[PDB]
């Protein structure tokens, strides 16, 4: 779901 | 804050094209879904497609492929929607829309729906 | 792709009562990817519930969501003078989101 999509980039950009 | 400002009304020829741009401004930009959604006259509100602009991952609705493309412009933070192929019935107000974060915003966690809408642009398409 | 589709048509009620909206879905609605928005008049919609029950902050308290796979509601609970609107549903749980036609709540007079 391309919708779920920028909640993935927020996890990586959270643990960095 | 982000707000999402929109290009002004345009009135086109069938078959011709339209670029529709939105300037958003308070957030981030390259990591959160932008989407354009458009109302025809007196009907409800429909989907096209939209853009996470950190890869330019494109998202378009099957009945509009091949007369859509949307970009992203990451160093104005600027979202561009193209259609091609005008016809009368592409007449509406179309809408960009950013999804919203839980904050209120406060840039944090994604939720998928819209909570930032454009003030919205009139494209007219006629002879 | 799924079809939402919102009942009644237009819904004709007193200010102070209680509104409630149907959304029913084609087929199952993914991890209740579903949101409402509010339309008034001459303006752009508004979030008003997200993820089936999900309130953002700012929205208030007399709307509230629920519902699952198939079937959702949106209900205010005192209809306030600024709520007599549109409302919209809206699935987002594949990559081909659709809204549905929308629901008039008009003041019953």
């Known amino acids: 779901n391309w919708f779920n999509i920028t909640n993935x980039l927020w996890l990586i950009x959270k643990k960095k | 804050q982000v707000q999402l400002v929109q290009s002004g009304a345009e009135v086109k020829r069938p078959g011709s094209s339209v670029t529709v741009s939105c300037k958003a401004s308070?957030?981030?930009?390259?990591?959160?879904?932008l989407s354009w959604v458009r109302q025809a006259p007196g009907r409800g509100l429909e989907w096209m497609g939209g853009?996470?602009?950190?890869?330019?991952?494109?998202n378009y609705a099957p009945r509009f492929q091949g007369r859509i493309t949307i970009t992203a412009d990451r160093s104005t933070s600027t979202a561009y929607l193209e259609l091609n192929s005008l016809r009368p019935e592409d007449t509406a107000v179309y809408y960009c829309?950013?999804?919203?974060?839980?904050?209120?915003?406060?840039?944090?966690?994604?939720?998928?729906?819209?909570?930032?809408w454009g003030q919205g642009t009139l494209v007219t398409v006629s002879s | 792709e799924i079809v939402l589709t919102q009942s009644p048509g237009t819904q004709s009620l007193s200010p102070g009562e209680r509104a409630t909206l149907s959304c029913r879905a084609s087929?199952?609605?993914?991890?209740?990817?579903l949101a409402w928005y509010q339309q008034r008049p001459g303006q752009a919609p508004r979030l008003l519930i997200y993820?089936?029950?999900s309130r953002p902050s700012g929205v208030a308290d007399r709307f509230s969501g629920s519902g699952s796979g198939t079937d959702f509601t949106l209900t205010i609970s005192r209809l306030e003078p600024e709520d007599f609107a549109v409302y919209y549903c809206?699935?987002?749980?594949?990559?081909?989101?659709?809204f549905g036609q929308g629901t008039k709540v008009e003041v019953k007079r």
């Open positions: 829309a950013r999804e919203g974060t839980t904050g209120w915003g406060w840039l944090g966690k994604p939720i998928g729906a819209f909570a930032h």
């Open positions: 308070g957030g981030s930009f390259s990591t959160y879904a």
């Open positions: 853009v996470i602009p950190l890869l330019t991952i494109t």
């Open positions: 087929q199952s609605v993914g991890n209740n990817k």
């Open positions: 993820g089936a029950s």
């Open positions: 809206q699935q987002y749980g594949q990559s081909l989101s659709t």
